[PDB]
Amino acid sequence: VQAVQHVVIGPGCVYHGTLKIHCAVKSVSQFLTEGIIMKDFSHPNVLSLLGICLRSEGSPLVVLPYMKHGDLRNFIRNETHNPTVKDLIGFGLQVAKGMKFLASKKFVHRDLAARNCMLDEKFTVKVADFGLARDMYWMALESLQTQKFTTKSDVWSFGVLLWELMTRGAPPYPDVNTFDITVYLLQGRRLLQPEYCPDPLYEVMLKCWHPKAEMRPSFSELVSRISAIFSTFIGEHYVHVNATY
Numbered sequence: 634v635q636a637v638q639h640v641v642i643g644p645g646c647v648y649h650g651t652l653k654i655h656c657a658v659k660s661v662s663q664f665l666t667e668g669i670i671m672k673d674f675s676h677p678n679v680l681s682l683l684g685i686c687l688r689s690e691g692s693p694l695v696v697l698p699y700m701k702h703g704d705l706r707n708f709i710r711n712e713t714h715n716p717t718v719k720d721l722i723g724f725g726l727q728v729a730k731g732m733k734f735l736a737s738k739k740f741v742h743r744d745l746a747a748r749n750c751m752l753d754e755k756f757t758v759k760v761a762d763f764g765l766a767r768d769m770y771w772m773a774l775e776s777l778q779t780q781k782f783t784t785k786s787d788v789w790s791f792g793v794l795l796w797e798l799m800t801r802g803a804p805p806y807p808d809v810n811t812f813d814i815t816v817y818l819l820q821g822r823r824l825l826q827p828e829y830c831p832d833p834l835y836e837v838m839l840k841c842w843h844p845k846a847e848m849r850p851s852f853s854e855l856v857s858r859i860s861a862i863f864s865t866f867i868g869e870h871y872v873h874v875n876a877t878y
């Protein structure tokens with residue numbers, strides 16, 4: 634009742650909100666629950682909770698920092714942007730860092746994908762779509778079979794997210810139907826290496842998709858390996874969109 638005063642800012646879909654600061658605003662005891670804990674999830678590569686509006690009474694309103702450049706998927710798809718291999722790998726280093734943070738908190742995302750990451754005005758990537766701002770506006774083999782999610786299944790998802798980055802936002806398995814993805818994978822298949830994807834980064838993808846969950850890299854390992862691959866590029870290789878996809 635009184636231990637929530639550090640989160641609450643008093644006296645559905647999302648809207649453009651004001652306060653000068655530009656925010657995005659998402660339309661009661663359990664509300665102060667995640668409000669306080671989500672407030673504790675502060676990291677440069679994770680979407681912050683600025684606060685909650687309950688007065689008087691509110692929707693209540695979940696208020697979040699506005700992200701100048703929107704979601705990562707639409708950003709890389711935009712034909713007027715000219716990303717390099719370095720930029721894209723950079724985005725998929727920032728996501729790994731955000732996830733490393735979430736995993737350290739033993740928090741499982743369950744729906745990691747490029748559409749659920751945001752980019753701000755400094756081009757910092759924020760892992761989003763969790764906590765109160767979790768909604769429907771990539772799954773590991775075992776998850777499709779058990780409906781259980783772990784950080785190890787987040788890692789599988791991250792591998793698919795890296796594929797998205799390097800294809801500039803192409804739909805994964807476009808000629809495949811959702812009902813039979815498990816059958817598809819169990820035939821011995823994975824997503825193809827993107828034309829502009831470095832061999833080592835594809836090896837990283839394949840590791841994220843290991844059939845044994847415990848053998849997939851931790852996000853700490855992924856941050857380490859991808860920081861290395863990233864450091865080798867200087868931004869001379871431009872990534873173009875694939876005609877078929």
Ligand SMILES: COC(=O)Nc1nc2ccc(Sc3nnc4ccc(-c5ccc(F)cc5)nn34)cc2[nH]1
Nearest residue numbers: 647657697698699700702703704749761762766770
């Ligand atoms: C030029 O893009 C913007 O509108 N800027 C923007 N800043 C935001 C700041 C917070 C939010 S709410 C939120 N919290 N987790 C998620 C995960 C995904 C999306 C999402 C992205 C794309 C899209 F089409 C529809 C939904 N939103 N979202 C939305 C925002 N949109």
